[PDB]
Amino acid sequence: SGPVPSRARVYTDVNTHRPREYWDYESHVVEWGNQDDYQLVRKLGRGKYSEVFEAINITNNEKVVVKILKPVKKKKIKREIKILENLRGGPNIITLADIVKDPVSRTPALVFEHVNNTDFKQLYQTLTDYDIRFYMYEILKALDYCHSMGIMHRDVKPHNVMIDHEHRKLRLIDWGLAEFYHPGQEYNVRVASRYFKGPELLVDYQMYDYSLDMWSLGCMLASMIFRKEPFFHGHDNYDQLVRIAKVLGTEDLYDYIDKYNIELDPRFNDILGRHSRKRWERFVHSENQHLVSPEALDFLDKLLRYDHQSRLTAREAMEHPYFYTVV
Numbered sequence: 001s002g003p004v005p006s007r008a009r010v011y012t013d014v015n016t017h018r019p020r021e022y023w024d025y026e027s028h029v030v031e032w033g034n035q036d037d038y039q040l041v042r043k044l045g046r047g048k049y050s051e052v053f054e055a056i057n058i059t060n061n062e063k064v065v066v067k068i069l070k071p072v073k074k075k076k077i078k079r080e081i082k083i084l085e086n087l088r089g090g091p092n093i094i095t096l097a098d099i100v101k102d103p104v105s106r107t108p109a110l111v112f113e114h115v116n117n118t119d120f121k122q123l124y125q126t127l128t129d130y131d132i133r134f135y136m137y138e139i140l141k142a143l144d145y146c147h148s149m150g151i152m153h154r155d156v157k158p159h160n161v162m163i164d165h166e167h168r169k170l171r172l173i174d175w176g177l178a179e180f181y182h183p184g185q186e187y188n189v190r191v192a193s194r195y196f197k198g199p200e201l202l203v204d205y206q207m208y209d210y211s212l213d214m215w216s217l218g219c220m221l222a223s224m225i226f227r228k229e230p231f232f233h234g235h236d237n238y239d240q241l242v243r244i245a246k247v248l249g250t251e252d253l254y255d256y257i258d259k260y261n262i263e264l265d266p267r268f269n270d271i272l273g274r275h276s277r278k279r280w281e282r283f284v285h286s287e288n289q290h291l292v293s294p295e296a297l298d299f300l301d302k303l304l305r306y307d308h309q310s311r312l313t314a315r316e317a318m319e320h321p322y323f324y325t326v327v
């Protein structure tokens, strides 16, 4: 009979109740303004399909970021743009300020709000217990908003979270893998980044939803409270499930596969072996204990679950006792 169908527990039909113009991104007309208003100042990073620069808008002195695009399918760029436009102005969502092109080279570019980021490899080791709770609540505001707007980010990871620590300002960026949620849709599982891929992706369960982002968020939380980055460090997508199984155990993995009638790729039986669950307290030690609390472990336990339906939604997560101390 094939895999058992699934629906999101929250915001299930939000796109169904909107007109085609909202979610049919392939029909969206993109118009490109003139990049001449922007003077490039310095390179900030390289993306999957872009080179990103700090720039200044010469007409009004605003500091921005210009994401200069490499050749990509028109469908992919329309998706990123339409999603950015639909989410523009939402809490902790990066603002797409302009869509432009250099007059001579014709190279297209996206212009964004600038964030003075401290890379996670330097920042995370300095965060206090309160800071982790604060920034986690900020990411949740972005995710509950985008999920309510019918969008899954599908690439939540530290690299995609810009933090201006001095100003306690966070923005979720890199909407290049984001997609509209339509209940019943069988999606491509080649999304997210290895260490942050949910078990639904790793076992090829296509009918996933916003809860994918909540697994990725749990991977980030575990790496921050335990000072173990990344938390699940697989050598490839198959070994990534083994790393997860060595923590969550194989019994619940096989129960998840059975519940959804998932056809498990034959290489898994040899590599998964048999593993009992490792209690979360086993990850606590002298150097991370000040970031751990019963509330942090209970919260993490409700994010890192095989069964995507059993994970906290972003709104349920915001109501968790772990955030009761957050102003």
Ligand SMILES: [Mg+2]
Residues within 6 Å of the ligand: 047, 048, 049, 174, 176
């Ligand atoms: Mg990317």
Ligand SMILES: [Mg+2]
Residues within 6 Å of the ligand: 047, 159, 160, 173, 174
């Ligand atoms: Mg990025």
